[PDB]
Design a protein around this ligand. Structure first.
Ligand SMILES: Cc1cn([C@H]2C[C@H](O)[C@@H](COP(=O)(O)OP(=O)(O)OP(=O)(O)O)O2)c(=O)[nH]c1=O
Ligand code: SF4
Ligand SMILES: [Zn+2]
Lengths: 216, 249, 216, 66, 251
DNA sequence: TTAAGCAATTCGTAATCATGGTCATAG
DNA sequence: CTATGACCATGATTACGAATTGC
């Protein structure tokens, strides 16, 4: 998306169109369409203005109803309360949640967790690696069923994988630095792709703690 | 009940090969005055009007005004299972949607087919009668060759009717050319003129219109100011066949 | 309407509608990132479904026909053949394509201006000279043919009134004109076609005489 | 002309003669005269020195699919 | 100002029908000797020399040694729009780069007047050698076309043996070997194999199918060959001049 | 200087192959 | 005038590339 910006120092801007276009996936993004979806509702105007003063009064009542609808949408959809809570949980300012993506927030939380043990971040940049293999899907038994099927699933799958096997930048073991120490049992583990990762009796990672705060 | 009998099935086969390319569906208005039809083409450009008068059928019988819905492709496939000398009778009920055709050889062999009709929701249009001011009566073979020969050059053609004769011109990327024709039985080109005419028409429609050439020897072309050009054929003591096409602006 | 080069790489319908400006307004047109609405009209260019697309307001004000065969075989048919097959066999494909077949045989629709207003019999559809509604063979059954179609005029009258007074309650006022051409409201252009249905069905019943005098 | 086209556009939006966007201009002029609200004798005297022109004898929005 | 007439004018249809499948263009050399055309082929194997003397025409006005170029197949598509009894007339202005064709009718009632535009040409031009042709054969054209087409369904290239008693048209193919023998017959249907010394050569039968496109173009066809030289097939355009197709031989 | 990820079902659009139909030429 | 052959196109089917949604 390509937008213009206008400079105002001290004051904050919240166009509700950009908030809708970022959070919601709808069919039309007109004010009439979202006011029906959430609440329930040029050349004529030039002759309502070149006429009399009750026509201009009708034009003003129309304009005031237009200027009133986004306030009702802002307070009804719990926009601003969620923006304040997002800025308090992540630690980024209130203008960054309308301009940026999801990188500045995870950079911010990782730096705020990095000052408490004394580490510095490096700069690696590469163009470019390859893809890796994603997720499995099981082959169906296609059709129509009329005997009950029960669904069992895991909740918060990938953050709990990253939590409970002690995976982090700061505990990734390089292939050589295990050698020539031979202590495998309860000092490190091995993954199906092939890496070795140190047990939690030596280090605690930084991404487990950020994830645990977000999960709570 | 409807039942007709006609001795020259060749006339029926020529009229059904006039129309099987331009039209896919039609409605036959069976009356006590004959068998009459109007239709527009599939492209919504041109009009056909066909009249087979009641007398020329050599055994006619119609009780009540009918309206039959015919797929012209299946009928054109049926009427080529009949040789050029047979005698054709048509048999229809007034309660049914299925037509019977019986072909009688002039020697031991008789054939009979049944064809399912369809109900259609078409609207019937017509024409008003005015006096077209340029009246050409010309041989049909020359008109067929003139249209087919100008067709390879470009797609439009301008008709230019002047005093002694008419002149057809056509252009294209490989050049241009005209053909004259002058006032001088059926190999003549009779030309009546009150006001001169010059107009432009596209060639694909004209090469559709010249598909019914074995129906007669001569063809009649009628023109006037800003009206659809009329192409007219006559069928001997049976009726006529007219195509209608609008000029380009 | 996404980034313009991927839509340069291969010809689409909505890109063709957007990049084709209007004569009325070369200053309001879709930009990058928004949604383009269109409908498909009927024509004879079968190689390209990107040559038959038009703006909904333009086909509203200029009254172009609709390609019912496009919508029948390309939009509707294959999702139905996904859903309805697994409960039955392939006689179910034949069952819905036969339920089409009993119902496919009912269709409704330069030189086009020179119509002679050819009248037609209401009973058996035979074009004939004179303005009377009934045919000479189907004259006895005329009370039943008047009975039939006045229950259609009666149901069009009931639909005019429910719609044109709903605009008065959505507008606010009962004493002034309605001006709302809201393209996202079903109310608009459903209130436009019933005027013409009623215009047509009222004139078909004046084929029959008047039920009495009016100048007494 | 060009001054007669603003008098009619001013007669068409005065609320004391009626809510008129479905009918003609002279019908609304005679409707107000029957009830005698106060039609002025100048919006009549331009609908007589013209023939059936669609830009005099028609309401302002006689286009416009409303 | 070039302006020429031809009453029995079917010959022009007949030559350009046998010209357009070979080559795409032609170098029309209009001299006071008449209408001439030397032109190579497109595959660099063959050549056409058309000569049309003035004494084979009817009515003539040549004021310029014109040297123009014709795209052949569009001209043939225009020549397909006139009958064979119809009179062919050509008109040309030395400043206006166009050809004005006038097709008169024998009953004079249908008049045609077509125009084809010009394109520039810088065509190559080589001279034929004049020599002794060790075998010159006069043959019916229809029988010759029949024989080489009868050989076309065996193989692709033909071997010829030209000698005193008979002439030997042999070929191989995917079904095996075959050959037909001919002899002299003891005015149009008469044959003659005039021979000094017997030879054997290789030629392309597909170019014989290309050369027999001028089958209705003469009384008799002439076949002139010698050792390792272009075969010249001759169609004597009756009372007019002659068309000679050269085929450079094979190795 | 600035940007979470991948798996896809699915249908459309384009290209290729097959099949017939029409026209022209030859006997 | 009729039959056969060739060309040409047209239609249908299959395979690939692209908006949106499921994770
Ligand atoms: C929706 C989504 C899922 N995933 C991955 C991570 C998740 O661990 C895995 C499961 O998908 P989800 O079931 O959609 O999410 P979840 O299991 O983490 O949380 P919950 O059960 O409470 O709804 O899919 C992503 O990586 N990005 C995403 O946007
Ligand atoms: S057209 Fe629809 S949106 Fe507009 S006033 Fe009527 S009901 Fe409301
Ligand atoms: Zn009737």
């Amino acid at each position: 998306r390509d937008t213009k910006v206008v400079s105002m120092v001290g004051r904050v801007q919240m166009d509700m169109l950009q908030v809708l276009l970022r959070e919601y996936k709808l069919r039309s993004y007109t004010l009439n369409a979202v006011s029906f979806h959430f609440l329930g509702e040029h050349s004529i105007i030039t002759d309502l203005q070149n006429g009399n003063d009750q026509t201009r009064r009708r034009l003003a009542v129309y304009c005031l109803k237009d200027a009133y609808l986004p306030l009702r949408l802002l307070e009804r959809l719990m926009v601003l309360v969620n923006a304040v809570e997002m800025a308090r949980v992540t630690g980024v300012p209130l203008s960054y949640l309308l301009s940026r993506g999801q990188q500045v927030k995870v950079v911010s939380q990782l730096l705020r967790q990095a000052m408490h043990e004394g580490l510095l971040m490096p700069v690696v940049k590469s163009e470019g690696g390859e893809d890796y293999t994603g997720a499995t899907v099981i082959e169906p038994l296609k059709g129509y069923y009329d005997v009950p099927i029960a669904t069992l699933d895991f909740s918060s799958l990938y953050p709990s994988i990253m939590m409970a096997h002690n995976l982090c930048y700061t505990t990734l073991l390089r292939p050589g630095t295990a050698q020539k120490l031979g202590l495998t049992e309860d000092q490190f583990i091995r993954t199906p792709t092939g890496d070795e990762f140190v047990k939690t009796s030596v280090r605690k990672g930084l991404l487990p703690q950020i994830l645990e705060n977000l999960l709570s | 009940m409807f039942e007709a009998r006609l001795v020259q099935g060749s006339i029926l086969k020529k009229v059904l090969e006039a129309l099987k390319d331009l039209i896919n569906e039609a409605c036959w208005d069976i009356s006590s005055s004959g068998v009459n039809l109007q239709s527009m083409d599939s492209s919504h450009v041109s009009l056909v009007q066909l009249t087979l008068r009641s007398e020329g059928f050599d055994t006619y019988r119609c009780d009540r005004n009918l309206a039959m819905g015919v797929n012209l492709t299946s009928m054109s496939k049926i009427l080529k299972c009949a040789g050029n000398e047979d005698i054709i009778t048509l048999r229809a009920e007034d309660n049914a949607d299925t037509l019977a055709l019986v072909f009688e050889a002039p020697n031991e062999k008789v054939s009979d087919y049944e064809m399912k009709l369809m109900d259609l929701d078409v609207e019937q249009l017509g024409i008003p009668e005015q006096e077209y001011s340029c009246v050409v009566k010309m041989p049909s073979g020359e008109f067929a060759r003139i249209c087919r020969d100008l067709s390879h050059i470009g797609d439009a053609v301008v008709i230019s009717c002047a005093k002694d004769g008419v002149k057809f011109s056509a252009s294209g990327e490989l050049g241009n050319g005209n053909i004259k024709l002058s006032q001088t039985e059926e190999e003549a080109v009779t030309i009546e003129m009150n006001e001169p005419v010059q107009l432009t028409f596209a060639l694909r429609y004209l090469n559709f219109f010249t598909k019914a050439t074995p129906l007669s020897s001569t063809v009649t072309l009628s023109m006037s100011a800003d009206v659809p050009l009329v192409v007219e054929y006559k069928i001997a003591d049976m009726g006529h066949l007219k195509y209608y096409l609008a000029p380009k602006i | 309407l996404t980034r313009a080069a991927s839509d340069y790489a291969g010809k689409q319908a909505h890109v063709e509608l957007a990049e084709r400006m209007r004569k009325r307004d070369p200053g309001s047109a879709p930009s990058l990132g928004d949604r383009v609405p269109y409908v498909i009209i009927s024509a004879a260019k079968g190689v390209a479904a990107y040559m038959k697309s038009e703006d909904p307001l333009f086909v509203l004000e200029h009254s172009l026909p609709i390609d019912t065969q496009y919508y029948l075989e390309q939009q509707l048919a294959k999702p139905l053949l996904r859903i309805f097959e697994p409960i039955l066999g392939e006689g179910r494909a034949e069952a819905v394509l036969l339920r089409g077949d009993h119902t496919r045989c009912k269709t409704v629709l330069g030189l086009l201006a020179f119509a002679k207003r050819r009248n037609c019999c209401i009973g058996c559809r035979t074009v004939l000279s004179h303005q009377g509604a009934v045919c000479e063979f189907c004259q006895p059954r005329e009370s039943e043919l008047y009975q039939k179609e006045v229950s259609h005029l009666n149901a069009l009258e009931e639909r005019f009134s429910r719609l044109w007074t709903q605009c008065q309650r959505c507008q606010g006022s009962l004493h002034e004109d309605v001006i709302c051409t809201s393209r996202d409201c079903p109310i608009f252009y459903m209130r436009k076609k019933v005027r013409k249905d009623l215009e047509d069905q009222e004139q078909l019943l004046r084929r029959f005489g008047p039920p009495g005098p009016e100048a007494w | 002309e060009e001054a007669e086209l603003e008098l009619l556009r001013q007669f068409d939006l005065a609320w004391q003669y009626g809510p008129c966007t479905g009918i003609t201009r002279l019908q609304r002029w005679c409707r107000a005269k029957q009830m005698g609200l106060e039609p002025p004798p100048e919006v009549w005297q331009v609908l007589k020195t013209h023939p059936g022109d669609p830009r005099f004898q028609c309401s302002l929005w006689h286009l416009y699919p409303l």
